[PDB]
RNA sequence: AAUUUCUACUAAGUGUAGAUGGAAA
């Protein structure tokens, strides 16, 4: 018994299936002749129209309640506010004041004033009726009587504002939180300034045609906050904030544009005030898309209007609080840091330099939990006051003014791409292709975007997020501006989903047939009100709907021997026994059905539920009273052989209900006449669909989709229980997007081409035709029908301890490792229990295997053409689709060959965790790819069934394991899933896997006298001329920053060559390097020579030596301009002395060390599962449970060091 | 370049190999 073979049936699932319903016979001359379509299809186009009414109700409701709508517990917290709390245990009260307020706020809405006659058929039924003044504002909605249900979804969406979910999608949380900030911070400037506004020339006159009562003084005072609640009254609140138009050409000018004004003394620098918000792109036509972005994003466009005034912003930016203002901390810094410094990483080292001159003392060497504690109180700072980078830049280093001069430039650039657009921006600019195809209207459109959408990005560091005093004369102007330049990304993100679009479109609506309850279930029973039914034809299954008003057209039908019968499937499965059944046996149905007291005493109790310590008899009394009434309740027992088991396996409720619901699932089958169906179709009393997909079609010999099997075995005499038709299935249409006038067709017997190198067969001459997207080139019915795979599940169990217990009991455990690469998409090794290279090989030849005779298909010679082809495409918004497409599609055919490894050893599976690395630019996976590929292999890896194989056994349809949780979010991936180990990727592939050696020093130029520390911190430096070679003794105790290694002691050499960076590219050899860095500067070099090195003081020469010895500790040697040198060197000897050199192996059948770098990291990789796995076997049955897998550096260290001896 | 749909295809000729959870927003 391997480990997989216990993996299985272990928890609930469900897939959905999708089928094409090819209509057969003549039922499309019935649908057509009793047009039974339009009316659907107007049924959809106009629904849009309902939900504009829904909003509109919504929002009138939202409106008159918030206008019948009071606050206490306001005057109290603004106090609270002002008061700087700064937390000491008076906050708390604060959040827990507000969050109850938010609470009871949103409790008019979830609570009184109706709500409930809103989300039920009710509305469109009495209240939107009601509400109502047009005529064909009500054609629409009482056309829509009848199908309530069609706004489900959209009424749950609806719940999100009425709610307190703490985000801005609800009422109380955007006119609450987006409401007390602002209302509070406005009413304290204004009891600030409120006396530059005198009376007698914007007091009155916003005192008059406004209220004529309250008329500006109440406004901001306290409790006030109640009435911008609605929305004319905060409404007239931000006119009055911003200026009013008095219905008429007077344009009286408000508070804010009279304190803008004020600055004519040119010294008040009084900031800005701020309304309040509030809740509640083309895409469509070309024309329409261009006229947008000419729009709005012209000369005079409030975009660009903003973009000169945030221009002039930065125009005085010098003259602002030099202190007050904040970068927030995060990835900005990384480069914020870089261009003005001019180092990558210039602010990082300053402050952590100076939390160690804080927290640290003056030991000897830094640790491993100290660097870790100070990176978190790196990330746990807030921001960084443009000050403290003054301190923490060198002297004579301007700041201000090097964040100007590089803003100014970003902006100057955004000029000059405006002046190469200025034919698009002209209008009386005409278009003349189509914008698709169509490029200098795109290629102009995209570099004006980005460069402008870069400033957008690159300026909104500029907030510190949520501080103390800030120059509020600056962040006023600035958020003025950035509210505004925000929408370019919606603009761009409206404009590249049109470029991208394809051409066909997969627009559906959903059939009804005139039935409200459509296809909603499937039971004999019941049919009457669904009217849906599934027939068989031997290999063919067809789908039957009759029509509204002959529902009983397929009842009275029997086979008669007519040499052929069409089948039926019936015999519903059991719904929601664990409910159903009390309220189909306590159904006030007592009145003449049995005659006891016992039975009803202890469900009065409810004791038969939990809350009891535990009964032989208490519990067992209702089940026992269900399981005689079962047998007694004819319309159940006259189906279902309910075969229960005996009494003593019996422990719970939840037992029982599980095997109820294991005996309420019979399908079965009635027969019917060929002939009689065929004239019910005929007749057009029965519209007949086939089901059908590329698999059913008979020319199809090869191996089926996996789907297809799923269905297929919906029927089968091995179906247990595993795959049942989870009832609620549906039938759309779509439209033939393509017009035919534009179809595409190699044409018959014309020799094609063929892509792929690998295939011999270099050419094709099929004898009828191949029409490009013919499937969308013509109307197509498909119905989609769900599933529920392991509905009632046996081995309930977690996943996460009971495979680290099988790995403790488990004396040989195999490990499969993945882990990216610069010349391989995936690399894959699996390692044995003992550290063994079982199996390495790369994935950029996924080898498809049909019909026995394999094809091997390259995927990363395809994804090198996709790329040169987006270099020279002149627009890449959908040159860079198609590859964020195909690596989508390439990490669709990589988990079948990880789901057959992991079946092949029964292992596990070793992930890089993406929340901890820092992929080096050339890796060929992107990240989000990647983490896409994660969530794509959790997914499978949750069902994992093989299709070759039979479907009875384990490992397949009705059988497969369940080896992994369900996916929950992106983030909470970490440190184990069921077969998966998310391990991080530190030192995992520079590091020799002969040794364990790493190469910890810093080996760059500081200073003459950092570079004679450094070299005098070796041991010995003697040009040993036996194997001529350079021999380096050292001690990591010497070098700093050396908390990780072990052995903490090497004898490096000079062994062989390595390859520059420089780009150029040049090949060079370290011991003749180091043989003309002793000649040409003169130093004898055949003895120790540390003393007679650091004679020389020429920064000529030990910055030139650092480097060289840089260039010795490399391993990690490449071309970076061709796949075939890419090796791996270690100039470590091991246990032999030889040293390590993947040229060695890459000529061996199956070696014992990794043959490429990129193999080295899977393999490191994997070496950490097996640390894990070590770890799991020293700790105890209870306590597998708690084992942490974070190997620490120290640690994989030391296990990649002592394991190999 | 044929597909419930996606990807790579032509895979021995109306298709082959994998994968696929849809509807709502
Ligand atoms: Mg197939
Ligand atoms: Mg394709």
């Keep these: ?86 937390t000491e245990k008076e906050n708390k009260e604060l959040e827990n004041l507000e969050i109850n307020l938010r609470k009871e706020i949103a409790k008019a809405f979830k609570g009184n004033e109706g709500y409930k006659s809103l989300f039920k058929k009710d509305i469109i039924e009495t209240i939107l009726p009601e509400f109502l003044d047009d005529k064909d504002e009500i054609a629409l909605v009482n056309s829509f009587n009848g199908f309530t249900t069609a706004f489900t979804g959209f009424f749950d969406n609806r719940e999100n504002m009425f709610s307190e979910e703490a985000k801005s999608t609800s009422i109380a949380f955007r006119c609450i939180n987006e409401n007390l900030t602002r209302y509070i ?85 009084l900031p800005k005030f701020k309304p309040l918000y509030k809740q509640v792109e083309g895409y469509t036509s070309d024309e329409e898309v261009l006229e947008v972005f000419r729009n709005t994003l012209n000369k005079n466009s409030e975009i660009f209007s903003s973009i000169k005034k945030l221009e002039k912003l930065f125009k005085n930016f010098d003259e602002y609080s030099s202190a007050g203002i904040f970068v927030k901390n995060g990835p900005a810094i990384s480069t914020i840091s870089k261009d003005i410094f001019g180092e990558w990483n210039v602010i990082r080292d300053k402050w952590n330099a100076e939390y160690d001159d804080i927290h640290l003392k003056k030991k000897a060497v830094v640790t491993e939990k100290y660097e870790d504690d100070r990176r978190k109180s790196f990330k746990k700072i807030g921001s960084f006051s443009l000050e403290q980078l003054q301190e923490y830049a060198d002297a004579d280093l301007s700041v201000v003014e090097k964040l100007k001069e590089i803003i100014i430039q970003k902006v100057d650039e955004i000029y000059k791409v405006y002046g ?224 229960f088991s005996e009494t003593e396996k019996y422990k719970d409720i939840a037992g029982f209900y599980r095997e109820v619901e294991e005996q309420g699932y019979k399908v079965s089958f009635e027969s019917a006449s060929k002939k009689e169906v065929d004239k019910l179709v005929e007749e057009g009393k029965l519209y007949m669909f086939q089901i059908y997909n590329k698999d059913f079609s008979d020319k199809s010999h090869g191996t089926p989709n996996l789907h297809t099997m799923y269905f297929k075995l919906l029927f089968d005499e091995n179906n247990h229980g595993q795959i049942r038709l989870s009832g609620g299935a549906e039938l759309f249409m779509r439209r033939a997007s393509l017009k035919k006038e534009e179809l595409v067709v190699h044409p018959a017997n014309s020799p094609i081409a063929n892509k792929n190198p690998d295939n011999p067969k270099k050419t094709t001459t099929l004898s009828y035709d191949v029409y490009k997207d013919k499937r969308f080139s013509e109307d197509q019915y498909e119905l989609h029908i769900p599933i529920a795979i392991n509905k009632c599940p046996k081995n309930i169990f977690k996943i996460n301890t009971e495979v680290r217990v099988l790995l403790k009991h488990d004396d040989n455990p195999y490990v499969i490792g993945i882990d990216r690469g610069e010349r391989n998409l995936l690399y894959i090794v699996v390692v044995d229990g003992k550290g063994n290279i079982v199996e390495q090989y790369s994935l950029n030849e996924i080898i498809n295997n049909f019909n026995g005779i394999r094809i091997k298909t390259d995927y990363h010679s395809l994804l090198d053409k996709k790329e040169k082809e987006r270099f020279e495409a002149r627009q890449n918004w959908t040159s860079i ?100 180990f998310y391990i991080p990727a530190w030192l995992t592939s520079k590091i020799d896997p002969s040794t364990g050696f790493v190469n910890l020093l810093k080996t760059k130029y500081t200073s003459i006298a950092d570079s004679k520390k450094f070299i005098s911190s070796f041991d010995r430096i003697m040009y040993v001329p036996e194997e001529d070679l350079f021999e380096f003794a050292l001690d990591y105790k010497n070098f700093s920053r050396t908390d990780a290694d072990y052995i903490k002691k090497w004898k490096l050499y000079s062994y062989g060559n390595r390859i520059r960076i420089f780009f150029d590219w040049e090949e060079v050899c370290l011991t003749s390097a180091y043989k003309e860095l002793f000649n040409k500067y003169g130093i004898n070099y055949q003895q120790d020579i540390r003393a007679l090195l650091c004679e020389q003081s020429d920064k000529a020469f030990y910055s030139s030596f650092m480097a060289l010895m840089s260039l010795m500790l490399q391993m990690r040697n490449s071309i970076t301009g061709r796949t075939d040198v890419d090796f791996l060197i270690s100039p470590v000897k091991n246990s032999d002395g030889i040293f390590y050199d993947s040229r060695n192996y890459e000529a061996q059948e199956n070696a014992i060390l990794p043959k490429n770098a990129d193999a080295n990291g899977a393999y490191n990789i994997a070496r950490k599962v097996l640390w894990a796995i070590g770890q799991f076997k020293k700790a105890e049955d209870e306590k597998l449970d708690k084992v942490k897998i974070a190997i620490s550096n120290k640690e994989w260290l030391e296990y990649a060091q002592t394991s190999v001896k």
């Excluded at 299936?17 to 299809?41: M, S, W, Y």
């Excluded at 989000?928 to 292999?937: D, H, P, R």
Aim: glycine share 4%; proline share 2%.
């Design 881 to 980: 689709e198609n590859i964020k497409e195909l690596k989508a599609g390439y990490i669709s055919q990589v988990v079948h060959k990880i789901c057959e490894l992991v079946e092949k050893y029964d292992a596990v599976i070793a992930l890089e965790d993406l929340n901890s690395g820092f992929k080096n630019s050339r890796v060929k996976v992107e990240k989000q790819v990647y983490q896409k590929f994660e969530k794509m292999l959790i997914d499978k890896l949750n069902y994992m069934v093989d299709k070759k194989s039979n479907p009875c056994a384990t490992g397949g349809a009705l059988k497969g394991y369940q080896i992994t949780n369900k996916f929950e979010s992106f983030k909470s991936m970490s440190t184990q899933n069921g077969f998966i």
């Design 185 to 269: 911070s406005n009413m304290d400037i204004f009891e600030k300034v409120d006396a530059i506004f005198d009376k007698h020339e914007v007091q009155e006159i916003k005192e008059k045609i406004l209220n004529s009562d309250y008329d500006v003084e109440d406004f901001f005072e306290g409790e006030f906050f109640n009435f911008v609640l609605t929305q004319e009254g905060i409404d007239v609140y931000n006119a009055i904030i911003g200026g009013f138009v008095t219905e008429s050409g007077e344009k009286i000018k408000g508070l804010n544009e009279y304190i803008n004004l004020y600055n004519q003394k040119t010294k008040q620098k």
């Design 420 to 643: 190469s657009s200025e034919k698009l921006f002209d209008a009386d600019f005409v278009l003349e292709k189509s914008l698709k195809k169509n490029d200098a209207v795109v290629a102009i459109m995209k570099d004006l975007l980005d460069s402008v959408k870069s400033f957008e990005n690159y300026i909104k560091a500029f907030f510190g997020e949520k501080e103390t005093n800030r120059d509020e004369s600056f962040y006023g102007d600035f958020v003025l501006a950035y509210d505004i330049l925000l929408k370019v990304d919606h603009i761009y993100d409206a404009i590249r989903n049109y470029v991208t679009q394809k051409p066909y479109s997969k627009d559906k609506f959903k059939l009804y047939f005139q039935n409200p309850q459509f296809m909603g279930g499937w039971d004999k029973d019941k049919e009457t009100d669904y009217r849906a039914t599934i027939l068989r034809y031997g290999s063919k299954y067809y789908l039957a709907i009759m029509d509204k008003k002959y529902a009983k057209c397929l009842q009275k039908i029997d086979k008669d021997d007519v040499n052929g019968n069409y089948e039926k499937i019936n015999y519903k499965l059991l719904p929601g026994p664990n409910k159903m059944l009390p309220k189909v046996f306590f159904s006030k149905k007592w009145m003449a059905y049995y005659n006891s007291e016992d039975i009803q005493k202890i469900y009065k109790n409810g004791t038969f539920k939990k809350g009891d310590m535990f009964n032989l008899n208490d519990c067992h009394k209702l089940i026992d009273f269900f399981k005689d009434s079962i047998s007694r309740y004819p319309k159940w027992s006259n189906a279902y052989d309910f075969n």
């Design 1 to 86: 018994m391997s480990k997989l073979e216990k993996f299985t049936n272990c928890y609930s699932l469900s897939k959905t299936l999708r089928f094409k319903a090819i209509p057969v016979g003549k039922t499309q001359e019935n649908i057509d002749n009793k047009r039974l379509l339009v009316e659907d299809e107007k049924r959809a186009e106009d629904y849009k129209g309902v939900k504009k009414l829904l909003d509109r109700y919504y929002l009138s409701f939202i409106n008159d309640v918030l206008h019948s709508i009071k606050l206490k517990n306001l005057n109290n917290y603004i106090s609270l506010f002002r008061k700087k709390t700064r």
